RNA sequence: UAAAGCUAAAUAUAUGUAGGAGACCGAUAGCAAACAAGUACCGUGAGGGAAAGAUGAAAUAGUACUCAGGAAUGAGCAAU
RNA sequence: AUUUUAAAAUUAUUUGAAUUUUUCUUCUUAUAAUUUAAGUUGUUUCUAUACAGUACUUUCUUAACCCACUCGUCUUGAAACACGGACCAAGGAGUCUAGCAAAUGUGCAAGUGUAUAUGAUUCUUUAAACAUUUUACGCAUAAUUAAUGUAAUAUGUCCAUUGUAGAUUUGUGCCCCACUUUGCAUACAAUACCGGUAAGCAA
RNA sequence: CCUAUUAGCUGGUUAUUUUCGAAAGAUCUCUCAGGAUCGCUGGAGUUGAUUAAUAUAAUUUUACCAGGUAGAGAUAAUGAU
RNA sequence: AUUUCACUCAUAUUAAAUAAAAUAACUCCAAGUGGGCCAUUUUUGGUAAGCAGAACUGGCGAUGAGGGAUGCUCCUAACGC
RNA sequence: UUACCGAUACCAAGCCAUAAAAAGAAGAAAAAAUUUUUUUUUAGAAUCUUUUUAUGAGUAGAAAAUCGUGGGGUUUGUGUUGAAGCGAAAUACGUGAGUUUUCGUGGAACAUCUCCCUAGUGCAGAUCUUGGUGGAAGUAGCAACUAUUCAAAU
């Protein structure tokens, strides 16, 4: 069912799973388009692992923005200069390969910059 | 053969891996020849190696 | 193995898929080998009229170009 | 440059872009040009009519070195020489160029073109053509043999 | 569903973008397509379309043909989308005003000595944006050799298609179906 | 100007050896073989022919001592 | 942020008139706002007076109504009483070369390519880059016939063959169409001219 | 070892989405499980339209054409009967 | 018969009607394809066949959705969420 | 004879993508406190930005935009305050290959999506190969050659 929250209108959840990935371990949950001949999914039988298509794509007016109504952006060491102007539009996430000292300085600068952080409590 | 192409004329019908030999050593062979001829003229007391024709 | 010896099914639909093509219907038709001893005269006719028209053209061109 | 190949777009397609019902088989028709006059003759008769049969007498050792003769049409003669010399020759009514085409590397002079009226030119070539000679002499020029 | 040819989507034919990845020419087309969009003159539209054509359809145009085609009216400026090649088969040239993309040093020297000036498309835009007093020309598109293999298949009755041959000796495609003596002919 | 003869250079190297390199492979890859390899092994013979790298900084830090069990091994408060 | 404006209607004035003959009767002269114009705005609560919870968003497991035949394959016809698949991890298949053609992009352009090779205070990287005394060759500039060979208007003029349309172009009625001016490219023809073979003549 | 011989035949031939999208005819084939060929398709590019036209139409109408199937015959031919 | 001139033949709905008629026309490169089948109607051989073989058209294949309990082809109807 | 129920067909509206279409190479709005401060923006990227309409099925088959992998120049970083990997997971993003994160383990390297060059590059299968593990199962079975019993030592 479509989920409606504020202004972001999402049309689908339950990230799609590969056909037959239930009773076959070697088939991983990552989706693929089965080619086959009589492969059911291609025929689109009534109610059996319906496949992704273009129609499920959300609205580009709101597409990439996160429930924070704010696009996310990665940071590594000190790259906060391009964030000063658009503090109402871009949230910042620390890269997972950042040590505690650098992450501490980044969180210090960001908090006074007044920009939200996603993984604030990382490795501490 | 497939429609409007030239008639194939490839003379590779016999074994040719046995005889393929590319020349990677062009420039270094040139340098070796230069050094050899320079030494040949240097050892000759300054007399030019070339001959009138 | 028995093989179907002929059919003409689906041929009309294949023909009309691209639409029945029409000849280009150009204006002039060549006279390479049509009823000679008439176009033999006609070629001389054209040469004569062209000669008169072009010689008058050159006469006018000279009398206007001094 | 390998990922630009067509094959890199059909990895998950079973047939690899070479058909399913027909299948891809090694040398279906026959190796080389094997279909001559038996089953591939329609292609030969449609694209290379005169491929089959032999015509003409035999030159044993042609030795192409003998009958080598580059050709120059008669109009390009003025273009051969530099344009400033062209201007001075055109200006003067008393001097005419001499073009020994052997120096440039040309042998025969052919009659195609349209020279400049009332201007003589001297030409020296191993061979001439009748129409070229007529054109040259019609404007006061001279054909001079050389060897 | 609907009963529409090509399911009701309009399909054109031609270049939708310049595949030519060349910054100066990209800037130039950015200028002329804008001129076409703003103005209503077909001249700008045509020249913008012609700057997008492939390399094989902006062909060289020789000085002889260019001068011959301006022989009717002497005061106008020629615009040719391709480059103009010098022709050694011409003797003298007279006061020609041209605008092309590329040139050849011999042609440039010849035209400068003649006394004209090589207008580039920037100068053409700055001087005559409405196409005034400019005649549009292009060299022979189909005269290129690869078109000699086109048309009817070589071997068709009354066909004039050069067939692909390794050479033109007396044993290369000269016997069967080309002379009455050996089977049919043509 | 045949039916006698000689000769360095310009040229080739999937051999052996000795050096030097790499938009090459990185332990099912790369030579069959990174290690005790043409070894173990198979076939009476011509011959066929493998698997197997990484403790740790330092084992000149490689498991001392107690208890239980025949010993293996186990547990500790004991110990690197 | 230069059509959420115009008018369109409504109210309340005013203007003249009208007619179906008057409290939604109509047509505007002039005025100010309303919106039925010109895509849903307002009011009251709750979340809630808290920093993680039973609330709130989400993952997972269970159930519930409805539906759903093992995939891959050759095949007109696959879930088949057609064949391969006990399971897992790794490896595993349109590549490379020569030659040609086409499409595209680039340089140069009647020329093009610098080949072998040459010179250099280049000589870790340098087995690359740089450079090439006034026709070396390939491919192209002209074709054709078995072949001796022959070889593209023709000197009236540095016009550059002729038609039918045909892009532009200069103007007449700175944006259309009809009138004369140029006639790209090309398309369909016609002409000449070169080789070849016929035919007539023929020293 | 030649040799990784050849195999018109069997099996396989690995990531997404979007756009377009078929044939199982016809000629020839020591051809009938194959192949070449046009026909159907895609991609590319060009000329013409963008001016409710002109080309154009699996369309109908107006005019003008050609056929010998059903049907009808046995006294109109032939053959019956 | 040709060329050049006269003159002018609806053209403002357009030498009948109607046209999502320029989604055209052409040229080039190329894959797959080249065993078909079912259905109303016509029809050949055979007694007949879910047979063998053709004909105009549509489908199936290449395709699911609702119905015929159920079904590769029947009826409605062809699929972005 | 009415009334009804009945589709991924039809109609109205919303959103996606494709194609076409119309058009484009520089200025202050509002709210809250109390005229002054605070609060949000003040946009101009042409294979783009704004807007309109139509359409949306597909095997063999072709093209485009794409997402990852081993390397390589080029820019610019992360690393003992623990990187690469791996297990579990995420009010996480896409439509989707996947990307990005938190916790635990780990003990030395890792990415570049700034643009590009290159390739032994993406797996479920091939009675695929190599290595390991199942159910079948504590089951079949441990059968010929007649036969062993007691007491003690060890």
TrEMBL record, chain B:
Signal peptide: none annotated. It comes from the Eukaryota. Belongs to the eukaryotic ribosomal protein eL13 family. This is 60S ribosomal protein L13. It comes from Plasmodium falciparum (isolate 3D7). The chain holds residues 2 to 54 of 215 of the full protein.
TrEMBL record, chain C:
Belongs to the eukaryotic ribosomal protein eL29 family. GO terms for molecular function: structural constituent of ribosome. It comes from the Eukaryota. InterPro entries: Ribosomal_eL29. PANTHER family: 60S RIBOSOMAL PROTEIN L29. Residues 1-30 have a biased composition (Basic residues). Residues 1-35 are annotated as: Disordered. It comes from Plasmodium falciparum (isolate 3D7). This is 60S ribosomal protein L29. One of its GO terms (cellular component) is cytosolic large ribosomal subunit. GO terms for biological process: cytoplasmic translation.
Automatic annotation (TrEMBL), chain D:
GO terms for molecular function: structural constituent of ribosome. GO terms for biological process: translation. Residues 71-144 form the Large ribosomal subunit protein uL15/eL18 domain. Signal peptide: none annotated. It comes from the Eukaryota. SUPFAM superfamilies: Ribosomal proteins L15p and L18e. GO terms for cellular component: cytosolic large ribosomal subunit; large ribosomal subunit. PROSITE patterns: RIBOSOMAL_L15 (PS00475). Coiled coil: none annotated. Residues 1-13, 20-37 have a biased composition (Basic residues). Keywords: Ribonucleoprotein, Ribosomal protein. The keyword Ribonucleoprotein applies. Residues 1-37 are annotated as: Disordered. Belongs to the universal ribosomal protein uL15 family. This is 60S ribosomal protein L27a, putative. The lineage of its organism: Eukaryota, Sar, Alveolata, Apicomplexa, Aconoidasida.
Automatic annotation (TrEMBL), chain E:
It holds the Pfam family Ribosomal_L18. The keyword Lipid biosynthesis does not apply. Residues 155-169, 176-186 have a biased composition (Basic residues). Residues 143-186 are annotated as: Disordered. One of its GO terms (molecular function) is structural constituent of ribosome. Keywords: Ribonucleoprotein, Ribosomal protein. The keyword Ribonucleoprotein applies. InterPro entries: Ribosomal_eL18, Ribosomal_eL18/eL18-A/B/_CS, Ribosomal_uL15/eL18, Ribosomal_uL15/eL18_sf. It comes from the Eukaryota. GO terms for cellular component: cytosolic large ribosomal subunit. Residues 1-186 form the Large ribosomal subunit protein uL15/eL18 domain. GO terms for biological process: translation. Belongs to the eukaryotic ribosomal protein eL18 family. This is 60S ribosomal protein L18-2, putative. It comes from Plasmodium falciparum (isolate 3D7).
């Amino acid at each position: 069912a479509v989920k409606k929250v504020g202004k972001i209108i999402k049309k689908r959840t339950k990230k799609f799973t590969r056909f037959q990935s239930n009773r076959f371990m070697r088939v991983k949950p990552a989706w693929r388009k089965p080619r086959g001949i009589d492969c059911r999914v291609r025929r689109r039988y009534k109610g059996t692992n319906l496949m992704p298509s273009i129609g499920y794509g959300s609205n580009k007016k709101t597409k990439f923005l996160l429930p924070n109504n704010k696009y996310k952006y990665v940071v590594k060491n000190k790259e906060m200069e391009p964030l000063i102007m658009n503090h109402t539009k871009y949230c910042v996430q620390i890269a997972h390969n950042v040590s505690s000292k650098k992450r501490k300085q980044i969180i210090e600068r960001a908090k006074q910059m007044n920009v939200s952080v996603i993984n604030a409590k990382a490795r501490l | 053969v497939a429609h409007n192409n030239v008639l194939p004329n490839v003379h590779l019908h016999k074994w040719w891996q046995r005889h393929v030999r590319v020349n990677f050593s062009k420039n270094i062979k040139k340098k070796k020849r230069r050094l050899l001829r320079e030494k040949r003229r240097k050892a000759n007391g300054g007399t030019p190696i070339e001959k009138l024709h | 193995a028995k093989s179907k010896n002929h059919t003409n099914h689906n041929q009309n639909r294949k023909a009309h898929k691209n639409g029945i093509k029409k000849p280009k219907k150009h204006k002039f038709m060549s006279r390479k080998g049509l009823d000679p001893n008439f176009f033999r005269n006609q070629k001389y006719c054209l040469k004569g009229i062209q000669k008169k028209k072009k010689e008058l053209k050159l006469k006018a061109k000279q009398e206007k170009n001094n | 440059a390998t990922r630009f190949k067509k094959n890199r777009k059909k990895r998950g397609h079973v047939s690899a872009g070479h058909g399913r019902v027909g299948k891809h088989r090694k040398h279906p028709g026959g190796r080389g040009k094997a279909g001559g006059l038996h089953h591939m003759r329609i292609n030969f008769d449609k694209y290379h009519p005169g491929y089959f049969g032999k015509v003409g007498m035999r030159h044993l050792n042609l030795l192409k070195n003998r009958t080598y003769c580059p050709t120059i049409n008669v109009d390009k003669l003025w273009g051969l020489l530099p344009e400033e010399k062209k201007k001075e020759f055109s200006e003067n009514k008393d001097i005419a160029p001499v073009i020994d085409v052997t120096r440039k590397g040309y042998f025969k002079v052919l009659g195609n073109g349209k020279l400049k009226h009332n201007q003589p030119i001297v030409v020296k070539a191993r061979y001439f053509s009748s129409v070229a000679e007529k054109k040259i002499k019609a404007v006061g020029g001279q054909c001079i043999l050389v060897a | 569903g609907i009963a529409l040819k090509n399911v009701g989507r309009i399909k054109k034919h031609g270049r939708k973008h310049l595949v030519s990845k060349n910054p100066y020419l990209r800037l130039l087309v950015k200028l002329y397509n804008f001129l076409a969009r703003r103005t209503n003159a077909n001249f700008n539209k045509i020249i913008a379309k012609r700057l997008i054509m492939p390399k094989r359809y902006r062909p060289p145009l020789s000085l002889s043909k260019l001068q011959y085609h301006m022989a009717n009216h002497p005061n106008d400026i020629a615009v040719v989308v391709g480059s103009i090649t010098d022709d050694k088969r011409l003797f003298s040239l007279k006061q020609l005003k041209v605008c092309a993309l590329r040139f050849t040093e011999t042609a440039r020297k010849r035209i400068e000595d003649a006394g004209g000036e090589c207008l580039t498309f920037d100068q053409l835009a700055l001087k005559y944006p409405t196409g005034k007093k400019c005649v549009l020309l292009r060299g022979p598109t189909k005269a290129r050799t690869a078109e000699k293999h086109f048309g009817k298949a070589p071997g068709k009755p009354k066909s004039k298609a050069r067939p692909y041959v390794r050479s033109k000796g007396r044993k290369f495609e000269k016997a069967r179906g080309r002379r009455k003596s050996r089977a049919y002919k043509k």
